[PDB]
Design a protein around this ligand. Sequence first.
Ligand SMILES: [Mg+2]
Ligand SMILES: [Mg+2]
Length: 150
Amino acid sequence: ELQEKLIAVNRVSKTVKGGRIFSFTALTVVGDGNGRVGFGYGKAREVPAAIQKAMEKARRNMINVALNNGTLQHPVKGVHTGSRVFMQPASEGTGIIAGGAMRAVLEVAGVHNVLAKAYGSTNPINVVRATIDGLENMNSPEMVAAKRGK
RNA sequence: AAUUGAAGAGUUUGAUCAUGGCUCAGAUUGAACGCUGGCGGCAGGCCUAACACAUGCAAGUCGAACGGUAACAGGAAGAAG
Ligand SMILES: [Mg+2]
Ligand SMILES: [Mg+2]
């Protein structure tokens, strides 16, 4: 069964003529724990509800990745907007070593051990999906062997 | 057998994304200060005035190199209570 995790919940203001109205935005990541991971960004005027919305959207935007064992193939660089990401497969008995929301994304995607680092802005929203871009463009030996033989 | 290696957070805005500074979570020391203080092992102990120094000790040893009896530990002769 899928597992879901909540990264952060924020508050945003609209300052209408009448006054100031506050809304809540939630970011969540869902995944099967083997190959499939997705993220959702929901909003609402109450917390519990925004979370719900997010989950729904995440489930419907899962993506697939190839994982040599519980680890990546090769080092990959992820970039989006203003957040750079770097990851290394590392050995097996090392645990997960990552920062804010990278632990969430990788654990949900099913990476039991990896070395990760974030450069530039650390904005949960960008860092999420910046990791996922790298996992997207990761190339596996099986799909690179389509060139010829092995 | 002797390469098992990399975490971030707070803070500018009504709110957002950047840029950019400040601050914190770690480790370490020949440390000092405050409160407190049972024992043991190993190590350490003037980082400032190469400023000035009372007192004691820290370079002596060879008679199997040679003249010698100033100490005195023996012996012999001689003079003697
Ligand atoms: Mg920055
Ligand atoms: Mg002496």
